[PDB]
Amino acid sequence: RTEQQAASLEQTAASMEQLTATVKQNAENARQASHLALSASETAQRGGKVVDNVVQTMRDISTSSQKIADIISVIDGIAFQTNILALNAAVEAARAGEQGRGFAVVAGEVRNLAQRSAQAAREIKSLIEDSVGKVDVGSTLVESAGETMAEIVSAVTRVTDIMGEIASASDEQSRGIDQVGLAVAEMDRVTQQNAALVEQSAAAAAALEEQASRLTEAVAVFRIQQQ
Amino acid sequence: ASLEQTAASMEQLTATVKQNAENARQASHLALSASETAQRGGKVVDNVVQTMRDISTSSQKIADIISVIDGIAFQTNILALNAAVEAARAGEQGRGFAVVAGEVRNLAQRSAQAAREIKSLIEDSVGKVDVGSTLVESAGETMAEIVSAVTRVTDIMGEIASASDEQSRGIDQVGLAVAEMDRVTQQNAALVEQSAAAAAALEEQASRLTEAVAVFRIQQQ
């Protein structure tokens, strides 16, 4: 009789719970998500000035690696100039006739080193430049990522707008879910008083059948002036 | 009016909870995506540490050549020195070689110093690959500390959406139950009506009697 009857307040009162619980659940998840959204926001501003100093110090590197190169040109110039003496040395050797012999050799020893020294310089040149090639390649890539930040801050600046709405639209959930509670409320008291009215009426009906049954008796008995 | 008013708030709720439910699911993407350009540095930077480990070496492979050059400079200096004794030997015809000798030595000296400078200058420089490996770990760290808050925003959003999904169903079930309300009330109102009629029938059936009793009371006094 009270089987499926009470079983209706189960539905709502029970469904109505989840409704008031998940309204707070994903109501604060929304708040952290907007401050956790700043976890990535500052990490984006610090990501900037920082990957920025990687472009920096990585930059003044290529320059220092130049302040060399023109020194290398010097060394090379020194070599070139020297390779020439070899000759003045050798000429002198000649003029000195028989004494030359020694002179002679040193001329060749000179020119020789000149060549070796020059050779050195080249190597360390093609190297010192070839290198800086890769320092600009990398300098570029790091440069470019650095910009993918100001964007991280525009994307996560929305997780702040969107989340900031759940916080005022999901807030309404209460304001609304509340007036709905008023209905599950009122709804119950009428799905209620009904059963009462039903009973009180079912009652009084039975009472009258009795009363009535009693007059029928009296008659049977005290009518006997008809017995 | 009110079962209407409530039913109005009802679907209005079904409203927010649809948008306010997946509007955030979009955010779960504006997040999954705010995590793609966060996964960029993850190489754009990672690679940068390779180059760093490169110059640091190559610019040493160089210093090695610089040494060789130094050695040469040395050697020519000795040569040059010897060249001057040779000039001294030749007595008079050495005068001109004597100058070559000197000229060659000076070249040797100059060649030296230049190397020394390269040296120093390389030291400072490659010593900076220090701050390179640093700012590359640091700038490479806020780049993983970026991908941290966005590991969550994709979470949180993908968590609330899967929650509000049923937010509906209940809001849905509730709505049905409270529908009858208005109906039920007429149901009751009707009952109340019968009751009044009952009352009244009885109200009068009684007097019908109480008054009969009244006649027999005097009419037998």
Going along chain B from its start, the domains and CATH numbers come out as 1-221 (1.10.287.950)
Q: Which residues of A are less than 8 Å from B163 in CB distance?
A: 22, 25-26
Cβ–Cβ gap B135/A57 under 8 Å: yes
Query: By 3-state DSSP, what share of chain A in percent is helix, strand and coil, each rounded to 5?
Result: 95, 0, 5
Tell me the residue length of chain B.
221
Among candidates B55, B160, B170 on the partner chain, residue whose Cβ is nearest the Cβ of A15:
B170
How many helices (H) does chain B have, and how many strands (E)?
5, 0
Find out whether B135 and B49 touch, Cβ atoms under 8 Å.
no
Cβ–Cβ gap A193/B194 under 8 Å: no
Q: What tokens were used for B154? A: 């994709």
| Cα B155 to Cα A70, A225, B24, B27, distances in angstroms | 57, 95, 11, 10
How far apart, in whole angstroms, are the C-alpha atoms of residue A171 and residue A178?
Answer: 11
Task: Residue A38: name the closest of B145, B144, B33 by CA.
Answer: B145
Neighbours of A131 (CB within 10 A): 18
How far apart, in whole angstroms, are the C-alpha atoms of residue B128 and residue A191?
Answer: 82
Cβ–Cβ gap B107/A82 under 8 Å: yes
How far apart, in whole angstroms, are the C-alpha atoms of residue B56 and residue A104?
Answer: 44
Among candidates B62, B66, B146 on the partner chain, residue whose Cβ is nearest the Cβ of A152:
B146
A residues 178-197 near B, CB within 8 Å?
179-180, 182-184, 186-187, 190-191, 193-194, 197
Check if A73 contacts B (Cβ < 8 Å). Answer: no
Q: What tokens were used for A25? A: 């659940």
